[PDB]
Amino acid sequence: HSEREKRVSNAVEFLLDSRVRRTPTSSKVHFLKSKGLSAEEICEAFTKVGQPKTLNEIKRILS
Ligand SMILES: COc1ccc(CN2CCc3c(c(C(=O)N[C@@H](CC(=O)O)c4ccccc4)nn3CCO)C2)c2ccccc12
């Protein structure tokens, strides 16, 4: 995997965890950015797990 793919893969695994799934979106977004994910990478991970968010929602959290 590329480093980007590893970031997204790690985010996917995170977002699937049952406790995580009960955490609000905002805190997960801020978490994922702290891990070094861009907004686009975060948006990709949310879509890969079937919890899709707009880019604009993600950028509003991060703003
Ligand atoms: C912001 O909210 C939270 C952050 C962290 C944790 C603890 N872990 C929950 C489960 C979890 C974590 C991580 C995690 O931190 N992964 C890192 C990579 C690593 O350390 O192996 C990571 C890196 C980059 C992007 C996302 C995740 N992965 N997973 C799933 C696999 O066990 C972190 C939470 C636990 C419960 C509820 C909310 C949590």
Domains, the chain, in order of start with CATH, read 1-63 (1.10.10.10)
The CA 47 to ligand 1 mean position distance, Å, reads 18
Q: How was this structure determined?
A: X-ray
Q: 10 Å Cβ neighbour count for 37?
A: 21
- Is 22 exposed, middle or buried, given 0-12, 13-18 or 19+ CB atoms closer than 10 A? exposed
**Amino acid letter for position 23:** T
**Amino acid letter for position 33:** K
Q: Please identify, by atom number, the ligand 1 atom nearest to the C-alpha of residue 35.
A: 24
| Ramachandran area for residue 50 (φ above 0: left; ψ -120 to 50: alpha; else beta) | left
- Check if the beta carbon of residue 4 is closer than 8 Å to that of residue 44: no
Q: Cβ(14) to ligand 1 under 6 A? A: yes
Q: 10 Å Cβ neighbour count for 35?
A: 13
Is residue 34 classed as helix, strand or coil in its secondary structure?
A: helix
Q: Please identify, by atom number, the ligand 1 atom nearest to the C-alpha of residue 16.
A: 30
